[PDB]
């Protein structure tokens, strides 16, 4: 059942994918791999093709790998990127080597989107529904996206979206960088540990700019965005401080002068009132009290999309091995397993 492989040279990288992979064109590389957009004569779509790049250069690597192919292979949602195929020319574990990631290919993401046109509130409410569609489905298999953004989120001509590249250095996060921009507070600051309810925060950051067209946190680094943040929601109170572990972030949270959250009706002027209502629900300083993906899919605001029979949660997936402790060549087997069981959609 081994398809048949052709290789060939593109961009001083050498490209070794069946078949049924036609016209590849180079669209980009980085520290992960280089990338080719592909036309899939199975399926018919355009793809992307990715060869990671020393995938087991070390144990770090190795997970890392490892970890992205799991989460890939376990995501079956319309408003998530999920995996088309994967393959490796190696026809067994000691020549595996090198590992080929095909996802969809859906054209631009949200940064993109906003730069071409002017987004209606409609445009809005279908964008965000998406999100927080593909967010229960995430959710309900205990997975957090971790640094959900613009960038993230891929849109096509007809509005559709999907999540990509789930969270899997901080220097990326210094600065006046929208890296850091949609990131809950108390994960930027180490403040605790991170739920998913961290994502919902990073919807909020990002309706809010659909709907204004700014940033809403544009911090210049970690305690100016921090201020923008208490600013707009209020210091924190005697029992979102009791959860904070550090007694130093404690003291200094207790040294800023307290004040109370602003009225978002002031302050996203002229927007929807529906819409108004739910930012202030998902953007609340205490993520405990943060309005979860599933109740936000009810919320009136998405009343002209929302269908709770037309709203998946996913499988159960298992991180047990996040917690695990194995060589290089361990992890790399488990890869080897992953790519050879993959069952096609």
């Given at each position: 059942e081994?398809?048949?492989?052709?290789?060939?040279?593109?961009?001083?990288?050498?490209?070794?994918?069946?078949?049924?992979?036609?016209?590849?064109?180079?669209?980009?590389?980085?520290?992960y791999?280089?990338?080719?957009?592909?036309?899939?004569?199975?399926?018919?779509?355009r793809?992307?093709?990715?060869?990671?790049?020393?995938?087991?250069?070390?144990?770090?690597?190795?997970?890392?790998?490892?970890?992205?192919?799991?989460?890939?292979?376990?995501?079956?949602?319309?408003?998530?990127?999920?995996?088309?195929?994967?393959?490796?020319?190696?026809?067994?574990?000691?020549?595996?080597?090198?590992?080929?990631?095909?996802?969809?290919?859906?054209?631009?993401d949200?940064?993109?989107?906003?730069?071409?046109?002017?987004?209606?509130?409609?445009?809005?409410?279908?964008?965000?529904?998406?999100?927080?569609?593909?967010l229960?489905?995430?959710?309900?298999a205990?997975?957090?996206?971790?640094?959900?953004?613009?960038?993230?989120?891929?849109?096509?001509?007809?509005?559709?979206?999907?999540?990509?590249?789930?969270?899997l250095?901080?220097?990326?996060?210094?600065?006046y960088?929208?890296?850091?921009?949609?990131?809950?507070?108390?994960?930027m600051?180490?403040?605790?540990?991170?739920?998913?309810?961290?994502?919902?925060?990073?919807?909020?950051?990002?309706?809010?700019?659909?709907?204004?067209?700014?940033?809403?946190?544009?911090?210049?680094?970690?305690?100016?965005?921090?201020?923008?943040?208490?600013?707009?929601?209020?210091?924190?109170?005697?029992?979102?401080?009791?959860?904070?572990?550090?007694?130093?972030?404690?003291?200094?949270?207790?040294?800023?002068?307290?004040?109370?959250?602003?009225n978002?009706?002031?302050?996203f002027?002229?927007?929807?009132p529906?819409?108004?209502?739910?930012?202030?629900?998902?953007?609340?300083?205490?993520?405990?009290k943060?309005i979860?993906?599933?109740?936000?899919?009810?919320?009136?605001?998405?009343?002209?999309?929302?269908?709770?029979?037309?709203?998946?949660?996913?499988?159960?997936?298992?991180?047990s091995?996040?917690?695990?402790?194995?060589?290089?060549?361990?992890?790399?087997?488990?890869?080897?397993?992953?790519?050879?069981?993959?069952?096609?959609?």
């Open positions: 081994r398809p048949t492989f052709y290789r060939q040279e593109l961009n001083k990288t050498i490209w070794e994918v069946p078949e049924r992979y036609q016209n590849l064109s180079p669209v980009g590389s980085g520290a791999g280089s990338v080719c957009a592909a036309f899939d004569t199975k399926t018919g779509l793809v992307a093709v990715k060869k990671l790049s020393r995938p087991f250069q070390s144990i770090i690597h190795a997970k890392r790998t490892y970890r992205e192919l799991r989460l890939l292979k376990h995501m079956k949602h319309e408003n998530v990127i999920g995996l088309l195929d994967v393959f490796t020319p190696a026809r067994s574990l000691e020549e595996f080597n090198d590992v080929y990631l095909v996802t969809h290919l859906m054209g631009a949200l940064n993109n989107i906003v730069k071409c046109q002017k987004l209606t509130d409609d445009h809005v409410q279908f964008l965000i529904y998406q999100i927080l569609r593909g229960k489905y995430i959710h309900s205990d997975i957090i996206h971790r640094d959900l953004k613009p960038s993230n989120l891929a849109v096509n001509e007809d509005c559709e979206l999907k999540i990509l590249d789930f969270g250095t901080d220097d990326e996060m210094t600065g960088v929208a890296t850091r921009w949609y990131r809950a507070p108390e994960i600051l180490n403040w605790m540990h991170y739920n998913q309810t961290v994502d919902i925060w990073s919807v909020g950051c990002i309706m809010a700019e659909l709907l204004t067209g700014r940033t809403l946190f544009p911090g210049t680094d970690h305690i100016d965005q921090l201020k923008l943040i208490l600013r707009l929601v209020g210091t924190p109170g005697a029992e979102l401080l009791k959860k904070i572990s550090s007694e130093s972030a404690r003291n200094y949270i207790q040294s800023l002068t307290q004040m109370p959250k602003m978002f009706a002031n302050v002027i002229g927007a929807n529906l819409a108004v209502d739910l930012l202030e629900k998902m953007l609340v300083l205490d993520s405990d943060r979860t993906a599933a109740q936000a899919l009810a919320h009136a605001y998405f009343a002209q999309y929302h269908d709770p029979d037309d709203e998946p949660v996913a499988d159960p997936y298992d991180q091995f996040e917690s695990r402790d194995l060589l290089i060549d361990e992890w790399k087997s488990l890869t080897y397993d992953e790519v050879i069981s993959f069952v096609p959609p």
